[PDB]
Amino acid sequence: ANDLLSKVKKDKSDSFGVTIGIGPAGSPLLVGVGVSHSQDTSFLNELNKY
Amino acid sequence: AVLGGIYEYTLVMNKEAMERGDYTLNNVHACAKNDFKIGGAIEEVYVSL
């Protein structure tokens, strides 16, 4: 009798966001900048032999 | 001559066993964060980022 098993799982996550605000005054001025990013990675593998 | 006859018996037994075990684990975590802010005001020009 022989048994073989292998079950592996992989998970990855990443997220980043940038915010910038610039304004000259003296004639008031305003500039807004918004950045958002998100990354997710998931992997699943299972092997079984008998 | 002697009259005795022959009565015999024999038995043989064998046995074997084996086991195998393998295990492994890996876990790595990474985290990075930064914060940068600038400020400038003169009087008239205002600078911020």
Side-chain angles (χ1 to χ4, degrees), chain A, chain B residues 1-7 9-10 16-17 19-22 24-35 37-49:
Chain A
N2 193 0
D3 195 0
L4 182 63
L5 193 144
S6 179
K7 179 177 73 175
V8 59
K9 185 174 175 66
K10 181 178 178 180
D11 288 328
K12 188 176 180 180
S13 296
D14 184 74
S15 296
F16 60 95
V18 181
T19 59
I20 299 170
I22 305 168
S27 178
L29 197 143
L30 181 64
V31 171
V33 173
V35 177
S36 178
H37 286 284
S38 179
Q39 296 292 321
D40 291 328
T41 301
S42 178
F43 182 75
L44 180 63
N45 193 0
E46 180 173 357
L47 293 174
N48 206 167
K49 291 181 181 179
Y50 183 76
Chain B
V2 183
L3 280 305
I6 290 168
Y7 187 81
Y9 172 74
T10 187
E16 291 179 354
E19 188 180 2
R20 183 178 178 180
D22 194 1
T24 184
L25 195 147
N26 192 0
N27 192 0
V28 174
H29 180 74
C31 182
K33 290 180 182 179
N34 59 6
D35 282 325
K37 290 181 181 180
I38 69 169
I42 189 167
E43 185 177 1
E44 187 178 1
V45 173
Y46 183 76
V47 174
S48 179
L49 194 144

